Amino acid sequence: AAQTNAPWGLARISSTSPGTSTYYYDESAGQGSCVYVIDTGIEASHPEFEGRAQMVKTYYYSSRDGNGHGTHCAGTVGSRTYGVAKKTQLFGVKVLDDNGSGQYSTIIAGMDFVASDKNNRNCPKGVVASLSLGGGYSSSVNSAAARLQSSGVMVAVAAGNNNADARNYSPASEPSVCTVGASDRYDRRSSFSNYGSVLDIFGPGTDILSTWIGGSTRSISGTSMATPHVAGLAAYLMTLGKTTAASACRYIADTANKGDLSNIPFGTVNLLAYNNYQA
Structure with a gap:
């Protein structure tokens, strides 16, 4: 499948090169997988979710996303x-x-x-x-x-936006989960993105266009935004049978675009998440 005029992050995760705008992906598109978005909630009624989003748990007076971050x-x-x-x-x-x-x-x-x-x-x-x-x-x-990872869930977490070593952040510094750094459309490490040896992969993190509350859309930056790229990729790859939850992070790293990111500190992986889809 090919989605034309896709957000640059989608186009990048299906591309060996930056600067393209078509997202290529197997039409299975992650069906039969589930992704938990642990955040501020989801505006499930957003037309973009097509009835596939639902709130399953809140610890607050409402499950509505009054923030937009989780949406x-x-x-x-x-x-x-x-x-x-x-x-x-x-x-x-x-x-x-x-x-x-x-x-x-x-x-x-x-x-x-x-x-x-x-x-x-x-x-x-x-x-x-x-x-x-x-x-x-x-x-x-x-x-x-x-524990969530051990229970059989592919856990993708943001490295953090401190431009620091992610070793000093949780859950970024948990070794067994997938710590995700942010990159921009020019294959630079996002200026804010944390780094260090605990990072497993980079994903599109700068100027990420996506849904927003009120049925709207907006573009915001952060390793918080690179993480759902890797989470969605993991679900996409698990639906394809190419990996399991326990090995998706390692698989994503094995199949990533290597050495294509700039301003990656010495000792941080130079790996950009890549769906390796060929038409």
């Missing part, structure tokens, strides 16, 4: 226009309030929710969790992400 990341995972896996099932877990903030215990409880809730969902092709959040280091948050 934006869910859109990058699997919206029809801005999504990687255009047929995946999206499950919203609102661990962040509408200010984009949330206590670590709530984030931990939301991660433990997904590890159990996936047994309440129909995801024959596999389960992904997209964690577009983070703060200071926390062994408890890391262990929560490790």
Whole structure:
């Protein structure tokens, strides 16, 4: 399949070269997979989700995305226009309030929710969790992400937007999950993107067009936005049978575009997420 005039991030994950605008992907498009968006919630009624998005858990008075952050990341995972896996099932877990903030215990409880809730969902092709959040280091948050990964969920997390080593951030510094850095349309590391040895992969993170609350769209930057590219890619790849949740991060890294990113610090992987789709 070919989506013309796609957001640059979609076009990049299906391209060996930057500067193109058509997203190429197998038409299976992640069907039969599920991606949990652990964020501010999802505006499921957005036409872009086509009834494939639904809120499954909130820790606040409402499950509505009063922020737009989780709607934006869910859109990058699997919206029809801005999504990687255009047929995946999206499950919203609102661990962040509408200010984009949330206590670590709530984030931990939301991660433990997904590890159990996936047994309440129909995801024959596999389960992904997209964690577009983070703060200071926390062994408890890391262990929560490790448990979610161990339960059989491909956990993709943002490296963080501190232009620092991600070792000092959670769940970015959890070794067993997929820590995602951000790159821009010119294959530069995003100026804000964290780095370091814990990073597993880079994804499109600068000026990412996706869904927004109120049925709108907008373009925002962040490793928070590169993460759903890798999460959607993981669901896409698991639907294709090319990898499983336990090995998707390693697989994505094995099949990534190598040495194509600039301003990658010495010791950080120079790997850009790539769906390796050939028509």
